[PDB]
Every structure is written in structure tokens, then in C-alpha cells.
Amino acid sequence: EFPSATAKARYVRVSATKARRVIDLVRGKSVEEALDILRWAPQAASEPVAKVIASAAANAQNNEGLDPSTLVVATVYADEGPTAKRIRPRAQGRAFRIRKRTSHITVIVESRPP
Amino acid sequence: PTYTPKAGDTTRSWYVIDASDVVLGRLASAAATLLRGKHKPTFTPNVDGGDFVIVINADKIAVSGDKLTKKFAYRHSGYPGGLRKRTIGELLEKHPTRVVENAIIGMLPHNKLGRQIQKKLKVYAGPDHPHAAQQPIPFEIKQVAQ
Amino acid sequence: TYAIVKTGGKQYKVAAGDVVKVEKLDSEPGASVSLPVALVVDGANVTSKADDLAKVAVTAEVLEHTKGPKIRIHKFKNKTGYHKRQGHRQQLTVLKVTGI
Amino acid sequence: AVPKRRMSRANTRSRRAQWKAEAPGLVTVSVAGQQRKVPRRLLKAARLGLVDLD
Amino acid sequence: VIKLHDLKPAPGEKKAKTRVGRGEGSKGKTAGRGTKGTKARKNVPVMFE
Amino acid sequence: ARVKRALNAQKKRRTVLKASKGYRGQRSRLYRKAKEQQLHSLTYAYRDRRARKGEFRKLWISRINAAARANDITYNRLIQGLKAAGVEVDRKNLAELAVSDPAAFTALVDVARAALPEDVNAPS
RNA sequence: UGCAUCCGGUGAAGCCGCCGAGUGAUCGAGUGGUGGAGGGUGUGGGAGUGAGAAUGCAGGCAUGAGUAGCGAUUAGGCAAGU
RNA sequence: GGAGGGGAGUGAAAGAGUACCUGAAACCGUGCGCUUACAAUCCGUCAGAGCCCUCGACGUGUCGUGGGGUGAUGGCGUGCCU
């Protein structure tokens, strides 16, 4: 067990698959390494995920009083949030559904020692 | 309850069969028996508790009738017209051990445990084998009477 | 030593102190039933003759009457509508063998 | 054409795992004194100053 | 003393309604009509042969 | 009165889905597909409880045959000799002896070989 | 629902479980968790009383799939800015 | 940047945060245990190795009237409805 701090970005306008694609690069990694990865990652979901990780880090630093050096992304997961529905019109009068998916990106950083 | 082997009960013994003037199916049935473990009272059909079986002088196996020329070992490549047949004499002069192998493999179960049991089968065309360190017991193919 | 005790229309290999589940006996816990045998093995010597065995019994203390596992039957035949649910807990007795 | 049957969870996930991202390999750079991490592709431009290091 | 909770119908006075189409352990899936025909969805007149 | 049937309905669903743990895919997750398998599963269990007696008999026989042929006798003549000697021992315990008391098995083999005739292939 | 009883903010129902029970539908005045306000039992009365199927209806969610496509026949680019 | 969140506070309760009573399932994830990359699987059943957990006992880890989860492997096995 370790001291920890959490963050959640709820109702993010990206899909949970496209969030997981980048989360899987940073799970278990240090916060510094994770933020660098997500900085230099071409995927757009890297930005929200990095915002959340930075938020949890700053929460550990300010609210909980932990050194940002010792921080690891001990847990992180995206959850398929709400899903707005739209109608794309198509050929021959038919109407296909479009799903604007959202995600809840939850991060829990731990201050594991070296 | 009824006995089941547990992780160290499977003892392995090495047997060696001289296949000189011995009938092919006779030998193969005996060897499959030993390889499966039917000769053992610890026999459990979900366990390869059998014994290792060396076969020597496989080239001197005995085949009755015109089987040496009119029994074919067939094989398919997966391709059309990819049926290649080879008689038992052709197979004996090319790859001697293959006839004894194929016989035993057919006499064995066609399953994952059968595959595991094949590994205990060693077949050699001469009278000599390298598995002497294992101290194999000679196994004469008897017939229990009644 | 050990023996092969006949009871419940079946046979059970037992020795003294061995606890065995058998079919229901018309007895009560703490009672000491005496059961016939089919074979006795006092190590090497093997008693197998019927008279020599009928001169022998096996004492066993009834510990408790119990019930076996729940068998759940659901007979089914396709395209008929035939289902038939049924259950079973077989009554059993636990015997601790005490002497042979 | 169309899919005859609902793909099982196992197979769906078996290939959906292949839709991943290769993370970029990073290297250290000492621009403005600080040690930052960039790609080796961008190392030169970072030494120069053509890399927005947020 | 005889209260309202002591009142019971006589034996055999009340037979349970048979409920058809409520499972194959009962008069289910056809309601005793069989498979097909006029008699599977309608009733035939008595004045008809 | 109007009856919301979810309350009575979900019971069989809970039952089936709790019985269908360990199943792959839909068969563990969905009532309609777990139900299909619980039919097959309990049919198979009923069948197999009765075939289990045969399978264990087959196993015991295999082991007895092995031990017997190690004592230089066939299973059939062993059974013949035991029935002639009045040994009511069952194949389960014979197999257990063959595994655990080979000496006692040899003793029973000697008993059976004695009780056999002098020409087993004679009408008598 | 009639009647008679009983439980309940010292935590009802519902839901999730554990431990179990019944020949079966199923049970649990056995237990914990969640939860927050009505329920259980017996005896009768009445039913919008039990769904897995109707190319069933409605909602939600999957599979395909992070796939196709991102809508002409002109073409965008650099610098600077915000 | 905001959205959203974390501390702090209100509240009996924020596992009541204007997306809000309870908050099932499908569905989606994360984590732990077991298993699986020589194998032909109506997907289960019966037997069952090994691993893990648990309850008791003695003695100090092997045994049991045991219970569970996994399942190597073997046998059997042609979905439901109409």
C-alpha cells in the first residue's frame, strides 16, 4: 500500500477506446515519463489524459503533500461514459446512427519510493 | 476412492524390442500397449504413465503376403493431385523406421496425449541405439495363456 | 491390516479408524453396526473363503446421518416441449471402522 | 458482403488489441539548462529552438 | 369464536382456474388446441358437418 | 390488478446464471443462452452419472488385467477363478489391491488359478 | 385485497453476495453489504399473475469496427499574427 | 483554457452534487488468482493432474465426512423454438 491521489476527467469528448490506446502507454510509468510520452504522442487523446495525470499529481503535491518525483501512475482507466446520438443521412432515404461517445478518465497516482 | 497418480507416481521404465523377424502389427500393438501403460495397474487413460519403448532392427520387420509391394503408405500434401503413395518396401529402403512408427502411431490414440506418447517412442533401423545410458530392459513379445 | 466390507449393496476398503460414507442404515449415531466382508488382509495373509469370512465381521460406529450432493435433474427433449425437473439428495451414513 | 455471425468476444478482443499505439522513444536534451525529453527525430530542432516545449 | 378469518370454502367448492399458455408444464403453447386448423384459432359451429 | 413481473421473473434468471458460471461467452452471461446450455449440461450430467459407473468399471478392469497379466493370467480367467472360488470381491477393490497391495492381488490370482479347471477349453 | 397477527429509521422493500434448503416451480422471520419506508406470515377473495422466440413493441448496448466514408470534376503554399 | 476533478466545507448521508432516490442486466473497463501460443473445441458434462483460496484437525504441514475458484489431460457429446 502507498499514499495516493486521484483525479477524474468526466464527460470528456473522446471515446474510451481512443483513450485506452494512450493510457496503455503510461500505465505503471512515472508521471514525468507519462507526461513526456503523451506530449510526444500523435494521438489527440494524449492531451486530456495528460491533463488528468497532471491534475492527480498536483493534487498529491498540494492537497496530500507528496513529492512529485516519487509519483507513479499506479492506476488509470477510461470508462465509456455517455453517448449522444445523431443521424447521418445516407443514400436512398436511409438514416444511420452516429454515436458521439464520451469517456471518464480516472487516474490514481501513488508516491511509491525509489 | 479410486486411485489417481499425483505428480511423482509416474515411474518411467525403458524397454527395447528387437524387431527382427517380428510381425509389424504384433510389435506395434505391444509397443503401443507399453507406451500407453496398459501393462501397468496404475493405468489412467488421462495420463501418459506409460514406458519408453525403443525399437531396433526396424528394417528387419516382417510383413506377410504381398503387403511389401501392394500395401501403400499414402500421404497428401494438401494440394490437388498431391496424393503421394509409397509401398512398404520402398519405405523400408528409404526411411526404415517410418513403417514401425506409422503402425504404432495408428495403434495409439489420436489425441494430445497420443502426441505426448509418441515422444517416448524411439525407433532405429539397426541393432544399436544410443539410449544405453537409460539401461533399457529387453522386452520379448509374449502371449499370456489361458 | 484392512478389509473389504460389504454394505449398501457395494464394497468399501476399510481399516480401523477409516471413515466411510455408505448408504442409509436403519441405525442411530453412536451405534455400532457389524458388517460382513468379502476379503480381509492382515498384511500378507489374505482371507478369501466365504466361511472363513462369515466367521469375521467389521465393527463400525455410526457418526452421523448426512445427505449427499444435490443432484439436479432437468430432463429435456428437443422440439417436444418435454422438460422434467427433479432433484435428489441421497441419504447416507458415516461410519468410522473400529475393529476387524 | 456482411458478417454472417456475431464475432465472439475472444476474437474481437484478440484483434482489437492489435489496434494499439507504439510509444515514441525519447532522449534527453539540455535546452535552456533543463533536461527535457524529446524524440531523437526532434533532437536537432530542440537544440536549435524549433520545438515548442510547452 | 367464529371470526372472518375462520371462514373457509367447503372442500371441493373451489377448483383453481386452469391457465393456458403459461408454460409447457401446463396446458401450454397451444392451450389444448393442438397445432393447426380451423380449431386452432376459431371454434367450429355445431350446425356444421 | 396490474402486476410488474420483473420480480418473479428475475429469479429463474439469477438461478440459471449462477449455475452457468465458468461457461464461455454468452453461455455464462445471458439467460437465454445459459438456459440452452443448462439443458444440455444437465442432460449430459444425467447421462454421465450412469456412464460413470461403466467408465470406472472399465478403468478397474484395465488395471486388473494389467496386474493379472503381470502375474501371468488373463482377466477373464481371473474372474472365472474368483467366481469359482467364491470371492465376491468387486472390481473396484481388486483394482485398489492391484495398485496398493500387489502381494494380495497375487494371492487372489493364485486362488483363482487353483479354482480354475485343468482344461479351461473343455465343456465340463 | 377482507380478517387476524407479526417485523420495521435499533433500518422494510428492491438490488448485490455468502452460507445453505427443498422432489419441482423455487425458498431463506438465516446472514452480511447497499439502501432508505414500507413489508412478512396464516386464512380466505380477486387477478392486467409468470415469455425465449410472434422477420414481436419501446429503450439502452454490442458485432461488423476504431472498419467504410468524411460529398466532385479548382490547388493550395509561405510569412506574420491571434 | 475550460469542462471535469481533488482538498475543504454544507448535509444524517455527496456510496443524495441541479449529469442528482434506490441504481439491476446487456455493454465497457481496471486490478488479483488460475489457465492458454503442436492445437481441430454446439463450447458443455463425467473423471481429473497441478496451482490458489478457505474451514477444521492434529502437529507443526499432512489429512479431512471437507468446501470453493481454476482448469492440463482423457471419455461422452449434432444449439433453442417452430
Taking Cα atoms as reference points, which of B28, B7, B12 lies closest to residue B123?
Answer: B28
Using a 7 Å CB cutoff, list residues 22-41 of F near strand G.
Answer: 31-33, 35-36, 39
C50 CB-near residues (< 8 Å, 6+ apart): F86, F88
Report if CB A99 to strand G is under 7 Å: yes
Q: Which nucleotide lies at the shortest CA–C1' distance from C74?
A: G24
The one-character DSSP state at B111 is S
Order of strands, sheet of A72-89, starting from the edge strand that comes earlier in the sequence: A4-12, A95-110, A72-89
Q: Which residue has the cell 507513479?
A: A72
Which 3 state secondary structure label does DSSP give B87?
strand
Cell of C28: 442411530
Helix H or strand E encompassing A72:
strand A72-89
Cell of F8: 418473479
User: How many residues comprise chain D?
Assistant: 54
Using a CB-CB cut-off of 8 Å, the residues of chain F touching C38 are 87-90, 93
Question: Where do the H-state alpha helices sit in A1-114?
Answer: 16-26, 31-39, 46-62
The one-character DSSP state at A69 is G
Which 3 state secondary structure label does DSSP give A39?
helix
CA dihedral angle for residue F40, residue F45, residue F50, residue F53, rounded to 10 degrees = 140
CA distances from B93 to B97, D6, D10, F2 (A): 10, 54, 49, 87
Using a CB-CB cut-off of 8 Å, the residues of chain A touching D21 are 21-22, 24-25, 41, 43
Which 3 state secondary structure label does DSSP give C11?
strand
In this complex, do D26 and A40 lie within 8 Å of one another by their Cβ atoms? yes
F68 CB-near residues (< 8 Å, 6+ apart): F74, F75, F78, F105, F109
Report if CB A43 to strand G is under 7 Å: no
Q: How far apart are CA B9 and CA F101, in angstroms?
A: 15
Q: What is the largest CA-CA distance in chain A?
A: 64
Q: For residues A72 and A112, is the Cβ–Cβ distance under 8 A?
A: yes
Q: How far apart are CA C98 and CA C95, in angstroms?
A: 9
Domain residue spans in chain B? 1-146
Taking Cα atoms as reference points, which of A48, A54, A27 lies closest to residue A102?
Answer: A48
Interface test with A, best of D13, D37, D42 (most A CBs within 10 A): D37
Q: For residues C92 and C64, is the Cβ–Cβ distance under 8 A?
A: no
What subunits touch chain B, counting only 3 or more CB pairs under 8 A? F
Distance from CA of D37 to the nearest CA of A (A): 6
Amino acid at residue number C34: S
Phi, psi of C2 (to 5 degrees): -170, 175
Q: For residues F120 and F85, is the Cβ–Cβ distance under 8 A?
A: no
Q: Which parts of chain C are beta strand (E)?
A: 2-7, 10-14, 19-23, 32-35, 37-42, 45-47, 58-67, 71-77, 82-88, 91-99
Angle formed by the axes of helices F31-70 and F91-100, to 10°?
60
Resolution in A: 2.8
In this complex, do C83 and E29 lie within 8 Å of one another by their Cβ atoms? no
Q: For residues F41 and F16, is the Cβ–Cβ distance under 8 A?
A: no
Q: Which nucleotide lies at the shortest CA–C1' distance from E26?
A: G25
Distance from CA of E24 to the nearest CA of C (A): 6
Phi, psi of B73 (to 5 degrees): -90, 115
Q: How far apart are CA A3 and CA A1, in angstroms?
A: 7
Distance from CA of D2 to the nearest CA of F (A): 22
Neighbour-count burial of B26, counting CB atoms closer than 10 A to its CB (0-12 exposed, 13-18 middle, 19+ buried):
middle
Determined by which method?
A: cryo-EM
Report if CB F21 to strand G is under 7 Å: no
> Which residue's CA lies closest to nucleotide G13 at its C1' atom?
F7
Question: Where do the H-state alpha helices sit in chain B?
Answer: 24-36, 67-70, 88-94, 97-107, 112-118
Asked if A27 is an interface residue toward chain D (Cβ–Cβ < 8 A), one would say: no
Using a 7 Å CB cutoff, list residues 57-96 of A near strand H.
Answer: 58-59, 62-64, 75-80, 82
D16 CB-near residues (< 8 Å, 6+ apart): none
Taking Cα atoms as reference points, which of B41, B51, B38, B46 lies closest to residue B139?
Answer: B51
Give the closest of D21, D26, D39 to A22, CB-based. Answer: D21
Amino acid at residue number A85: K
Amino acid at residue number F30: L
Strand H bases within 7 angstroms of protein beta carbons: 2-7, 19, 25-31, 38-40, 42-51, 64-67, 69-77, 79-82
Neighbour-count burial of D6, counting CB atoms closer than 10 A to its CB (0-12 exposed, 13-18 middle, 19+ buried):
exposed
- What is the β-pairing status of strands B121-123 and B52-56? parallel
Report if CB F4 to strand G is under 7 Å: no
C-alpha atoms less than 13 angstroms from C-alpha of B142 in its C-beta half-sphere? 11
